[PDB]
Structure formats: structure tokens, C-alpha cells
Amino acid sequence: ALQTIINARLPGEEGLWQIHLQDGKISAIDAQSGVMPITENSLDAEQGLVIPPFVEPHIHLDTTQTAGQPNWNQSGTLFEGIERWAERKALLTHDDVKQRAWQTLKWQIANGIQHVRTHVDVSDATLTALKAMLEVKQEVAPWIDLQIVAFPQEGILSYPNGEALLEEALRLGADVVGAIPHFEFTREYGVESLHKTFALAQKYDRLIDVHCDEIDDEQSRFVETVAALAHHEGMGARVTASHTTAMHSYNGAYTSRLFRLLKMSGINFVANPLVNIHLQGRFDTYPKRRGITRVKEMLESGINVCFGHDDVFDPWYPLGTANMLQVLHMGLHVCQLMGYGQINDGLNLITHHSARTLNLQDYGIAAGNSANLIILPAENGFDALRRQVPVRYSVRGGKVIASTQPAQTTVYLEQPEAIDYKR
């Protein structure tokens, strides 16, 4: 029966703050002039940072926890990954998908993630994973708001009954329409697939999230069609272009021309640093390109960009604990957003920007919003990132749904000394 969050630090704000809770919502936020005493019904943030929940804007829960089954992706490429997944997709069962999705979802709850957008492969006449994921969505609702993207992994026009299956997925309840233009047989199929994707999103009033130009091909420019169609339909807010790794390889003049449209369109962008650094640059010898989209430039231009984990122990990525601060750490390094302020502001890439990408309507520490927030045992975004701190408490609807008792390290010198890695 929590009534208040006290001694809280807030990004971009000076001092400590008190967050009053009432009926599962935030009733008011007031600044404090000093440290407040703890008491019953008060959750002490202990001068730690309080922020809305971490968000996972791009993950594949249907493939999670399947790395090496039946075989391993030896080349470390997107293309072999799809082929290795195809082998596993043929062996899927309802319970298998639910068990694995839930295992990763629990790690996400433990990591303060209360909003997740999972893509689900719908290039499968049986739609096995989709049916399973729709049940998981209902089951996990008390802890995570899960969005499902109908993702035509093998193409819309390049796979038998691809468009029909994509629409069937929407009729069954998928929240977002997906696409993968660079994987279609031809550039023309790629462009046409986007017109079909947008028509379905308008027909069913759904969001859009395209696996867009995930390839080191300077000629892969499907992103301009995604942005142009969004601008034409006046629906930028509901549209997302995931990856756009090809943008890392575009010449600067085209990119500058393109950026005007990206900003005017208002669409969202997702970069997946852990997976992008691994799968991109695989066709170069030396030097080897990084392959992440132009994150730094998007931020400088006011274009909404955010980070996703993409994969957790599957054909496209053998690692992960579904930790967003870890995803952010990799992104800041590869994108060279290493200035103090850029690092400190990094939290935006895994909180607010991701919420906008998911078109969330109830997100942020503000009066009237649901009492969904997490507490990090750190002074600010920089500190949280540097020390890769766990989530001390995760609060949803005004109730604690996860907590982590921090590790305790001691070094035995002339006398025992506690080490917290702070300066």
C-alpha cells in the first residue's frame, strides 16, 4: 500500500523529489529541500535515480533461448541466421514457444522492463508462434505491456501466401504490421511490400515497424519509402523503421537530403547495438565497418531514435540477459556518444525515446499517469551506465513487482573495506 516515493533524483532536475501515489497513479510530484525520513508506506529511493520503466522496443521472443538448435549460425550473418531459424521454426510447438518467451520475459521484469515489443515470424502457415505469443501477452499483462509485431520474416511478396498470412496475423490480434523489404527478391517487391504494409496498417488501425535495410548495401534505401508513405498518410507517430544499418554506408549527400524527409515524416528509428555490431560488417575484410545506423546525427537533428536488444540467445545472437543498460553501453561506444552529457542523456535511448517508438499513452513520471516507475541505485544516467547498476525496485500500478538486493564486495587489506566502485 505504497503512498510515496521519497528522496528521488530525476534526470535533468536538481535536488531530491517526492512522488505521491494514489489509487495506482502518481497524484503529485513535489521537490524536497533536504532528505526526508523513511516511514511506513514510503519507498525510499535513497537519493537514487527514479525514471519511468525501461522499454524493450525490439526483441524476438519467438526465437529466444534457441541458439544452436538444430545448428549454429557459423557465419554470424543475418542471412545464415534466417536459414538457421527456418530449421528451428519447423520444430516449433505451442508450449515450447510459451516456455521460452516467458523465461526471457522474467529476466525483463527483473531488469525493470515493463514495455516490450516483440516481433513474431508469420512466414508460417500454422502461425504456431503467433498463437502462443497471443496467450503469453495476456498472461504477462500484470507485469509487462507486450506489443506483437506480425513479422513476415521470409518476405511478403517473396514467400507463398505471404500477404495473406500477414493479414491473418492482424486479424488474430497482432498490434503492429511488420515487413522486410531488403529480403524480398527484388527492389520492386521491396517497395511494393511497403505499400501493402501501409495499406494493412490503415485498414486495421495498427502501428508499423519495418525491419528496414538491415544490410551493408549502400543501395538499400527502403527507409525513404517508409518515411514518405508515413508523411503522405500523416501517420509518422505510428511508424518505426528498425535497424536501417545500410544508412551507415550511405554517401553523405544522399543522407543529408534524406534527413529532411526523416524529420518531416516524424517516424521512429530503432538501432540494435549488440546485434548490429555482430551481424554487420561481416562481408568486409579490413577495415571493417561498425554498421549501426546514424544515431548521433539523428539525435542532433531531433529525430527520435532508441535502442533494442533484438535477440537473446538465438540464431542471431548467442549472448544476453535482456539488460537495457548493457544494450545502451554498447551503443554509446560504437556510435561514439562518449561525451559526458551524451552518456548521461543516454537513458533517454532506453526510456522516453522507446516509449515514443511504441506510441505509449501512459508513460513518464507525471501527475495523472499510472504509478509505473523504477529506482536505480545511482546518482544520474552517467553513473548508472558506468556501473551497470541493477534495478533496485520496479513499481507498477503503485506496487513493487521486482527488487534486487545489490551485491556486496569487500577487499581484505590491512582492514576490510567495502568497494562500491564510486568516486
Added chain:
Amino acid sequence: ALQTIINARLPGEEGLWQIHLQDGKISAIDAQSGVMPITENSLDAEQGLVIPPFVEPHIHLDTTQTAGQPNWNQSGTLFEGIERWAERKALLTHDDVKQRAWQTLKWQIANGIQHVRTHVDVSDATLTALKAMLEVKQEVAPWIDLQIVAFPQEGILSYPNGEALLEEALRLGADVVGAIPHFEFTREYGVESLHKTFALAQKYDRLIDVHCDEIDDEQSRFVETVAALAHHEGMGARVTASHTTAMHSYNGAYTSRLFRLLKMSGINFVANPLVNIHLQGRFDTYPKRRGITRVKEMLESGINVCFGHDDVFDPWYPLGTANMLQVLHMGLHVCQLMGYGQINDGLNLITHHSARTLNLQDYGIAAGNSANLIILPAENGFDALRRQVPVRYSVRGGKVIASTQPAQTTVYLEQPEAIDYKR
């Protein structure tokens, strides 16, 4: 008064093992056929992984904890970094250096690091940091064996009295001779500086560790002189080429020719992933090169290569907690050593390979060696890396010098559930 380490897993070995300790050394190692019972004087590894101590083969303890003083490195380049450091170097004091070096050394002890090689800038007539570091070396000896590299940061031939100061540093006790050929005014000064570096190492019987070709210049090939001189003097084991980031930009034909010499010479290589990904590629627009040396190819050719953290919160790197598993994580991603076996074998890059780089004579879990070892709460190298586990216990001379009580995470679902991120 520990007498045994029980229930230990060892890299590359099947089953559990018992490590008997006697007089501060490992007396014997025996395989177990099942789980052994705990008892007084027995340290239970609890089926966790036991390995010799982590090693930090390349760090700058004289500059650590000084990021932003007096100003920040705004460009994120090696060159501005040196210039920003120059401003701080002018404000150094004995106690200042000792305090900061010790702060980072404590984090290293907490992180199971018992061997550290620190470079110390000796392009300073007062040799302030060097005098301070020599005292720190004596002070920290019970927990860490610290090697000091006399590092002529501003060049040997390109800085006033550079060679004289370098030799003075050796006469005062520095363990390793350093150099920085790519920073010298001319290619000729670069080559000549290496002849002088080798002559000093032979005159004083010291090791060598060159900041070698840390620049995105395909024409920076000082590494061939380092390797050739080592081969000529028959001293490969005592020589290290740090960085060699220029190798990331060499054409393949020259690299192939060069590799024959690298292998024949027997010299060591250090890659610094966290810093290299940040400082390299800064002169590219898009695409942007990764800039780490050819780690994967060195491993395939049997060339000894290892990883260092390089910097901890200073002019060249604003982050860090001096954690080697974190350094390894970045290196595996950027170097694309992402196959299951490559990741699992990754521990070698921060243990055995680094010990060879430091020319250590008492290292490894073997009968007769000092009882210096650490325990990771993980099943193998892959698991330790994936979950970024802390060091449960660090043992030196048969005594516990550091321990970490792991964090405890719980998610409150229909019932409370402990989350350990394992599969």
C-alpha cells in the same frame, strides 16, 4: 588457514576438481567423481569456475580518475587526449597520483585482478607520477604484483631530453621500457626511437611494451621494426606491441607477409577494446571503421594476443570500473569472436595470454605454483561472460583477499521467484 578448494570446474576440463593448498602454494590437483562435502578449511567453489587471477596488461594509473580536469577531451581522439593530459600533468602532485592510483587498484583487487602493468608518463622532467607509482608498487604488493612501464608519452626523440628521462626512469626502477613511434615527428624518428628502446631494454635487462601504431594510418608500420628487433635479439617473450590499431587498416597482402614475422618473433600483442572502439575511426565519416587490431587472425595463427582496459575515467575514456569481463565482452563483439567456442575460450584473453604478455613466472592452477586463484560463480567461460559475473572469491598466497556476495533479484509474480538469469 585454507587447506583445499573443492567442487571446482576448470576451463577445458570435464567434471569437478579439488585443489589442495600447502604453505601458500598449490600442492596437488585431483579430480573428483562427485560433489565433495564442505568442511572447515575448505573453500567451496560450489561447481563454479576456478581460474588463475585476472590480469590487467595495459592501464594508465597515473592518469586514472582525472577525466575533465582541467578540461574534457571534446573530439574523443588520441591526439586531443594527449593534449588534455598535458594540462593535467602540469598540476600533478605526489599524493594526488598515489590517491588516484590506489582508488583504481582497489577496484581491481575487488575484480580479482592480481597482476597489473601500468604505463606511467615519463615525458616530465620532475618524474612526479613515476616517483609516486614506485611507492604505490611497494604498498600494493601484498595484493597485486604491479609492473611499471616508463612511457615517453610525448616521444623519445621528439621531446626535450626524452631519451635521458626514459633512461632515468629505468634507473629509478621501472620494469618495462615504453615508446610511441607513431607520435614522433617523423617516420625516421619513429624507427630510431625503437632502436634506442631495445638498446635500453638490453642494457638494463627490462621488458618492452610499445604504444605501437595507435592510429588509423595504413602507413604506420612500426610493428614490423618491433618484431624484427625482437627476433634479432632473441627476446620475443620480453616484448609487447600495444594497440597496433593501424593493422585494422592494412591491405591484406602486407598483413599476410607481416604475420610470418610476428609469429617467428614471438612478441606479444595487447588490444584495448573499450578505448580502441572509442578513439579509433574518429577521422572517418561513414562508414566508420572499428579500429581494433587483428585479434581473430592472431588467435588463428597462434600469435599471443590479450586485452587491457587501458583507461579508467581519464582523458582517453570517461567510463570504467576496471572490470576485465567487461573489457572481454566489448572485444568479442567488435572483433566478431562470437561463436560459442570463441566466446567460451575468451577467458584466455584476460588470463593466460595476459600472463604471458607480462612474462609471469608463477601463474596458473598447477602444483608448485603460489596459491593465487579466483572463483567465478559460473559454469564456464561462456556463462561467466554472458552474465558478467562478479568474482565470488579472490585467493592470494592461499588467503582470501576479496569476496563478493552476489546480488539477489526477485520478481513478484503469482508467487515470489528468484531470478539468476541462467538457462
